[PDB]
Design an enzyme around this catalytic site. Structure first.
Site, PDB file in Angstrom:
ATOM      1  N   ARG A 182       2.806 -39.649 -21.855  1.00  0.00           N
ATOM      2  CA  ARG A 182       3.679 -39.082 -20.835  1.00  0.00           C
ATOM      3  C   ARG A 182       4.937 -38.412 -21.370  1.00  0.00           C
ATOM      4  NH1 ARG A 182       4.979 -43.406 -18.682  1.00  0.00           N
ATOM      5  NH2 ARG A 182       3.114 -43.548 -17.353  1.00  0.00           N
ATOM      6  N   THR A 183       5.553 -38.984 -22.419  1.00  0.00           N
ATOM      7  CA  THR A 183       6.781 -38.417 -23.004  1.00  0.00           C
ATOM      8  C   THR A 183       6.453 -37.264 -23.911  1.00  0.00           C
ATOM      9  OG1 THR A 183       8.104 -40.402 -22.843  1.00  0.00           O
ATOM     10  CG2 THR A 183       8.719 -38.861 -24.605  1.00  0.00           C
ATOM     11  N   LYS A 199      -0.067 -42.277 -46.593  1.00  0.00           N
ATOM     12  CA  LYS A 199      -0.016 -43.131 -47.789  1.00  0.00           C
ATOM     13  C   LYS A 199       1.047 -44.245 -47.688  1.00  0.00           C
ATOM     14  CE  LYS A 199      -1.806 -44.134 -51.838  1.00  0.00           C
ATOM     15  NZ  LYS A 199      -3.171 -44.756 -51.918  1.00  0.00           N
ATOM     16  N   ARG A 231       9.473 -39.756 -31.832  1.00  0.00           N
ATOM     17  CA  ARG A 231       9.460 -41.075 -31.227  1.00  0.00           C
ATOM     18  C   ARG A 231       8.987 -41.968 -32.363  1.00  0.00           C
ATOM     19  NH1 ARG A 231       8.864 -42.874 -25.669  1.00  0.00           N
ATOM     20  NH2 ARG A 231       7.912 -44.964 -25.600  1.00  0.00           N
ATOM     21  N   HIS A 275      17.021 -43.746 -25.975  1.00  0.00           N
ATOM     22  CA  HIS A 275      16.008 -42.904 -25.309  1.00  0.00           C
ATOM     23  C   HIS A 275      16.810 -41.906 -24.465  1.00  0.00           C
ATOM     24  CE1 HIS A 275      12.352 -41.469 -23.871  1.00  0.00           C
ATOM     25  NE2 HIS A 275      11.858 -42.520 -23.238  1.00  0.00           N
TER      26      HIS A 275
END
Ligand SMILES: Nc1ccn([C@@H]2O[C@H](COP(=O)(O)OP(=O)(O)OP(=O)(O)O)[C@@H](O)[C@H]2O)c(=O)n1
Ligand SMILES: Nc1ccn([C@@H]2O[C@H](COP(=O)(O)OP(=O)(O)OP(=O)(O)O)[C@@H](O)[C@H]2O)c(=O)n1
Ligand SMILES: O=C(CP(=O)(O)O)Nc1cccc(NC(=O)CP(=O)(O)O)c1
Ligand SMILES: O=C(CP(=O)(O)O)Nc1cccc(NC(=O)CP(=O)(O)O)c1
Ligand SMILES: O=C(CP(=O)(O)O)Nc1cccc(NC(=O)CP(=O)(O)O)c1
Ligand SMILES: O=C(CP(=O)(O)O)Nc1cccc(NC(=O)CP(=O)(O)O)c1
Ligand SMILES: [Zn+2]
Ligand SMILES: [Zn+2]
Lengths: 310, 152, 310, 310, 310, 152
Positions: free
Chosen positions: A54-55, A84, A105, A134
């Site tokens: 959604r974000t 890695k 994020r 956020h």
């Protein structure tokens, strides 16, 4: 250049009242008058070290609504950037030689600010860093509140749910405490009560706040009922069952609600907001989610366009 | 039920649950599977009442309730009157005493309780408190307010 | 506005003969005269709740061939849209505040139609919903048949494979039964025979159809040999071995085939069509797959462009 | 026939003070006078629907020390003996036709109670059922306490750590409340406080208890210091950081401890007890674990033999 | 030395009617007169290349009831004792140097037959090999039938459910066809009909069988009603919905059953038999499972002992 | 009729669902939520009937049923009679005729149908065949016998 041109957007504590107002003002303009070519020829990296459909879709859609191209990844199973074990520092160092702005994020608190120290001239916008910040969610919440309430000052704001862990409510609280005369109602089981540091912050700024155990205790006088998702692993199943009614809303609970009252929820709801609420004029969570587009456009616009044409 | 002239008639042998709160009659028919029989039943919903204003009434011919089956109506219709009847006379009359154990009808609000996916019937120990009844599940051994157990 | 402007494309049973002809007509035009800017400034969501590389790349390529921007996801490991447990209803409700059209593939039958009831003004195109519908595949199949055969009426059509479970063949059968005088040949092991409901439908519409156990039984008179992939888990390994030859095609099986005959297969083949068939003029499965682009463009064009310039 | 013969061992609530003593008295006897053929010819099921290495090895060893055979599974299961849906009821109806007793651990509360309703004449020993009971862990705890203190009456007991979710501290408190004159000290942050229902049971029985913030406050008076593990997988990393550092036991904290004081821990200890404590005479967690074999042997022998001449 | 001494138990096809009786006659003896030290000193391998909880626990219990030790593995394996490529042949050549008998379950047909070719002097007992054989499941079935009916001749046997893929119904039919005057009733939808090769074997032996659509049709005449599980993981959800509802057994269906009639099911039953059947006297699936211990003990004792004095 | 041996009374206006088969009156009360009204309701279950032995009967007072609503009873009570009673006069002996569509009360036998854990109302297209009614789901688009849909 505008105040936010080429700046990083890591925390809501780095943004001033003018900065917020600037984002919302811009958001309004973009919502009203679309600029599909504004960021034409810009390439933005959508870096989801932590998956979030959604974000990420909201952000990426905002990107394309302005005309920019996108490159990125989701749920980095392992490392990501020549998988890695390299550092996040090195990953950002490289990706910042490719793009004009990085939206990321990450599951670790601090990730977005660390990226800032390696991105060079490339701005990074924090789409979420562990249980810390956020900012783009708060901006969309703020935009939704101001548009439906006409203002951000002197509001009766209720916050229900997991006030303890939800970063969105902490964040929204602080942003609103940058405005005058807001009144808060914190409805949560004591096991998920709003942190003592958010209450202190409000004490110092001299802000009115009270604790309630039920929505109906204050339903009659709230302008915005901000619901949150209570994480179920947080609690014991029986524990969760015994407090469950404290933070769930039904259509019938809205009988004495103010006409102007809107219900917000960063989503997902499902366990807190019954579907019979959706058809009422108070339900505003899907509208709120739509506003993430204008808030996210405003943000990329401001950060990447020196002279913003509106 | 305090009224006469335009209603449901009396029967000879059987049980008559009277003074059932409005909107609780149908719930009792469902929860306790009362219509699941061949005997003749007669129901009155939202009947005018002198005392309660309105109430429900259930009549079940040739069927009787032990004092314990009566007590199971305690969490739903506590002010109810169960009438035992033979040869048109009210042979017996009793009211719901809250029981010490409630089986089959409730469900453990605990989503992780073993009772849910399993071929067992629910069972709770009942014990009163200042402002409510505490319901303890036989399996999960967790105790919950009757307000949680009863609610949706 | 054209007949299909702003409409949902959920099932082939909702499309009329004119609607199909309209899609193919448009497909032809787009194939002939490209409109790279037709959907410029449109943002389309490519929602693959069920992963499918070939259908997703085909669809997305169609999207870019028209100039539209794309956002989306594949194989939703968990939920998708702020991963957790929210309903598909809520997921569509949100995504429909971001995009102009939603293309989705889902493992549950009904998914595309349910999305329709929450998408609002946003059209949804069904890229596949469990064992129910797959309209865009049928449209591309229809386009391929009509282009190589010059028509959709009075055709000798053979369908080989898993006629029981394959949604493509059920779908293609019904679409062709909207046209006059088509003759069908169903070659399948009885364990995977064409459903009794498809045969009834054809009985009522008075359509000629026969059952055969071998391709050579009718090879000499078919215009289109439509092969399907027989799911191997459907059968017991030994069972599958004993019927395997019934539905496999080799170059030598084409000795008495009509010149005009083309072989289609929605792919993947590998177990049904030998590679020596690829070099013959009858092999048309890769061409067929290419036509998914023009059929998918036509569809998005029609649904998103009110006045279609051709 | 002893009072525990053929009885199920599901909950500490079902066991009387006399039942407790019987078990501890038999465990002391078997510890001193092993009876390696007592259960010779008996087959016991070790059913760990929830994987549990320490508990299972402890139980299985007890089984063999009495001469019984063992069959079972430890799973971290994918519906073990279910196949996407077989009920626990049916799997117990089957297994109870195979063995003489069932020892089981399961993730759901009540699981063992349900089993006794389907095992007929086969005793069910609960090795843990979700957050409900773990009766044998409490028997071995009580045995360790009685053996090192010479009594279960008039003790000073401190329980430190996660008192809110720890099912073993809840059972130990309940069990000890069946004896007289014990005093409890609870050391936990507020978020993990010993539940009110436990405190209500003690108040209601005239048993004194107190809350303290560090071990230094009670050290001089404590006979048994019971450490419990922090269910850290429940808290925020930051949150677990602040609380951890407080309720950790170092050897130096034991400077003023009484000579009989013993440190207990159901284990694993990792962040709660520093390794320098291990060498002190108070360290008794390994010894406590070793006592699980005698507690469990006793329990098995009492349930399967009418009368024991030990 | 008994006829089964040192013989492999791979297929029902290899066992004669006399072999069958010998096994059932020994199972009745051991059930009545346990010999807990008979296989004392013998070590048996429990090799479940294919995980199988019920079967493995059943087999392992039988092993212990005769006093043998057990070593083995249940895997859901990642080439167990292979390492990306060791052959089943080599793993048996190794294990047959360790133990006295090998009990094995494997996903591929023929696996047990292959093992006997590499185990030298060590007997191989097949606990299931893909869709081929499961001889011990048939021995315990036959034992349950003989014990409750007093014979394996002149029985009325109905087999319901998935007759097409059920390897146990195929072996039970074959085994029963070794006796005289039995009559079979097959209740299955067409998609899961008892295979023609089974019907050919019966026709070819003068054994009458009939097809019926519901249990009510045969109920009054049936002595043994054998229910089998629907391999639902093979059908479409919709498809499994239509067929399921038909061939499900409810207690009321048994109103006209004969007093000796027994309901059998290799298990798991889940959707095939309603729990209200469990309380009726006909319910005998748990008892059948318990009989797997005597069938399997018999089998082990006969293969490992020259002569049994029971 | 069977209404006056002992009086279940006769109502003025409203409807009188009569001739409901035994053990179906309760289903109707449930599936269609008929008791969620404040109107006076009187039910009779297992009452006697000359043409079938027993029967059920619902009396929702002063509340009428549309043409479709009455057809919604056909799948459960086909040979049943609804009565549009007007001031003590039975004015309209309607009857359940099979509808084209059945909404809300059915459940899609298809476990994979999107309809199950979603906020939508079930919907089936009805049609007679071999005469056993094939029910077709709006969402699933799969068709089953009324006996599979109805089983659960
Ligand atoms: N043979 C009978 C006798 C009584 N009843 C009903 O059962 C109740 C009996 O009430 P009654 O004995 O007349 O005493 P009340 O005046 O109703 O006072 P109470 O309700 O407190 O007993 C009433 O609903 C009556 O209509 C019945 O259905 N059949
Ligand atoms: N004012 C009225 C009139 C009629 N009814 C009910 O309507 C039903 C049918 O009555 P009616 O059609 O007039 O005669 P019947 O013989 O019952 O019709 P049928 O033979 O179809 O049963 C009966 O339950 C009757 O009690 C009622 O409750 N109130
Ligand atoms: O709508 C969103 C963003 P998304 O689900 O990642 O698309 N909410 C969101 C995203 C990331 C973190 C949080 N954290 C919260 O505490 C809010 P909630 O608990 O209601 O999801 C909330
Ligand atoms: O070419 C395609 C689409 P893709 O593989 O998803 O790119 N075929 C396709 C896609 C989705 C479903 C089906 N279903 C069928 O029954 C056709 P088949 O069995 O031949 O793959 C077939
Ligand atoms: O991981 C283990 C070992 P297991 O029981 O063999 O699974 N935990 C374990 C083992 C034995 C006893 C207990 N007792 C507890 O109280 C567990 P916790 O303190 O984590 O709630 C816990
Ligand atoms: O999952 C199980 C238990 P397992 O054998 O211990 O793996 N299946 C099982 C166990 C015992 C016997 C049988 N018999 C069968 O016929 C299996 P199915 O009916 O699934 O083909 C099947
Ligand atoms: Zn419970
Ligand atoms: Zn459906």
């Amino acid at each position: 250049a505008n105040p936010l041109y080429q700046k990083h957007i890591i925390s809501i504590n780095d943004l001033s009242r003018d900065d917020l107002n600037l984002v919302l003002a811009t958001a309004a303009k973009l919502k009203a008058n679309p600029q599909p070519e504004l960021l034409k020829h810009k390439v933005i990296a959508s870096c989801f070290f932590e998956a979030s459909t959604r974000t990420r879709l909201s952000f990426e859609t905002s990107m394309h609504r302005l005309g920019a191209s996108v490159v990125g990844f989701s749920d980095s199973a392992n490392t990501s950037l020549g998988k890695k074990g390299e550092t996040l520092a090195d990953t950002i160092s490289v990706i910042s030689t490719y793009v004009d702005a990085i939206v990321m994020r990450h599951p670790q608190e601090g990730a977005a600010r660390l990226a800032t120290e390696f991105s060079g001239n490339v701005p990074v916008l924090n789409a979420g860093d562990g249980s810390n910040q956020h900012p783009t969610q708060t901006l969309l919440d703020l935009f939704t509140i101001q548009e439906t309430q006409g203002r951000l000052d002197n509001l009766h704001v209720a916050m229900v749910g997991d006030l303890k862990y939800g970063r969105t409510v902490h964040s929204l609280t602080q942003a609103l405490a940058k405005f005058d005369g807001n009144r808060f109602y914190f409805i949560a089981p004591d096991a998920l009560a709003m942190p003592q540091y958010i209450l202190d912050m409000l004490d110092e700024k001299g802000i009115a706040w009270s604790l309630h155990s039920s929505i109906e205790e204050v339903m009659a006088e709230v302008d915005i009922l901000y619901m949150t998702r209570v994480q179920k692993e947080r609690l014991d199943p029986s524990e969760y069952a015994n407090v469950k009614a404290q933070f769930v809303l039904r259509a019938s609970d809205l009988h004495n609600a103010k006409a102007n009252m809107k219900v917000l929820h960063p989503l997902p709801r499902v366990d807190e907001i019954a579907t019979d609420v959706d058809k009422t004029p108070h339900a505003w969570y899907f509208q709120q989610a739509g506003n993430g587009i204008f808030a996210r456009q405003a943000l990329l616009a401001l950060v990447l366009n020196r002279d913003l044409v509106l | 039920t305090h009224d006469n002239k335009l209603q449901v008639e009396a029967i000879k042998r059987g049980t008559v649950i009277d003074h059932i709160p409005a909107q609780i009659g149908f719930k009792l028919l469902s929860l306790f599977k009362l219509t699941e029989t061949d005997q003749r039943i007669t129901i009155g919903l939202n009947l005018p009442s002198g005392e309660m204003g309105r109430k429900d009434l259930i009549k079940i011919e040739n069927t009787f309730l032990s004092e314990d089956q009566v007590d199971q109506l305690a969490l739903y219709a506590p002010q109810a009157t169960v009438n035992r009847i033979d040869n048109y006379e009210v042979v017996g009359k009793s009211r719901p005493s809250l029981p010490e154990r409630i089986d089959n009808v409730l469900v453990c609000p605990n989503s992780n309780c073993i009772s849910h996916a399993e071929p067992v019937s629910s069972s709770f120990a009942v014990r009163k408190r200042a402002n409510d009844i505490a319901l303890k599940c036989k399996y999960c051994e967790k105790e919950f307010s009757h307000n949680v157990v009863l609610a949706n």
